[PDB]
Subunit: 103 residues, 3 copies
């Protein structure tokens, strides 16, 4: 399993929720943020989306996010992929890929 | 050392602080969030807790969180475990497990 | 590439932005938080800064943060370093170190 961190323009949150639903993804945690980078130190409002996903889905999610969110204007955002050693569902104590099931 | 990310119902924050104190954990950083998943895309309020811990404590913290927070109702939340390559205390410049000491 | 998580007193955010600019770092995402630890469970306001950086810069950024932010008073904060498997720029679809370029 992998962690995705998706940092976007807030207006693009609906489209990120749809991309993850369209790949069977079970859930997501959304944080408000301020970001700085190339867009013109100017801070701008951002949404930071965290989702845990099965390893075979990551490549298609990254392609989907570029194809559907790109505006060709500076500031569209970033996606990173990082490793997960253990995942647990609090309600059941289930570990591994069972912890992300649709139920 | 490992990073835990604990995503919970906000009413359960007091019990997460007590579980970490009961395992000698030095600290925690708390973020407000909105989450989507199985509970009935409906966004619901969540707390996202980050804590850095010694590797031998992770198994007992995961057991404690399942045993004390489970309600057997959908939406109790998730815990993940991920790797840490370096940890530094800003005040002293100390690295490694010394950076998390109680002082 | 590596992820840094920098958890600080809010008054120190200007100095963290300057340290990252002084090492050529392209950007940063800023989250408001509450933290608990050694400082006197008392919750205190914090800023949580996430930045993605090239591996050869991490050692000098950690030294800079200790030298410029240390007050020798408990509560100055923490820096962690964690691994990144993939980085993508949404606007272009570019991966790897190209995804963090100044443009
Ligand atoms: N090195 C970085 N680390 C973390 N977040 C970054 C980094 N660079 C950019 N970001 C985030 O992505 C947002 C957009 O980045 P920006 O450089 O303006 O756009 P682009 O990626 O289109 O060149 C920023 O406002 C910030 O939230
Ligand atoms: N795949 C996921 N990635 C990240 N956060 C998730 C994921 N699935 C669920 N969550 C988080 O956990 C919360 C509860 O999940 P939910 O599916 O409703 O409960 P359960 O785990 O009891 O089936 C969500 O509101 C969200 O914050
Ligand atoms: N184990 C920990 N995991 C995550 N964040 C931590 C941890 N310990 C401390 N912190 C964060 O760093 C802040 C300052 O830590 P504190 O223990 O008061 O200072 P010091 O590091 O100077 O002893 C906390 O308020 C919290 O945000």
């Amino acid at each position: 399993m992998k962690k995705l961190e998706i940092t976007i323009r807030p207006e693009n949150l609906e489209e990120v929720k749809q991309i993850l639903s369209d790949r069977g993804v079970s859930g997501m945690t959304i944080l408000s943020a301020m970001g700085a980078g190339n867009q013109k130190i100017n801070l701008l409002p951002k949404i930071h989306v965290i989702t845990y996903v099965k390893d075979h889905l990551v490549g298609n999610i990254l392609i989907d996010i570029h194809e559907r969110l790109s505006t060709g204007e500076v500031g569209d955002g970033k996606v990173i992929v990082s490793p997960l050693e253990e995942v647990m569902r609090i309600r059941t104590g289930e570990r591994g890929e069972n912890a992300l099931s649709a139920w």
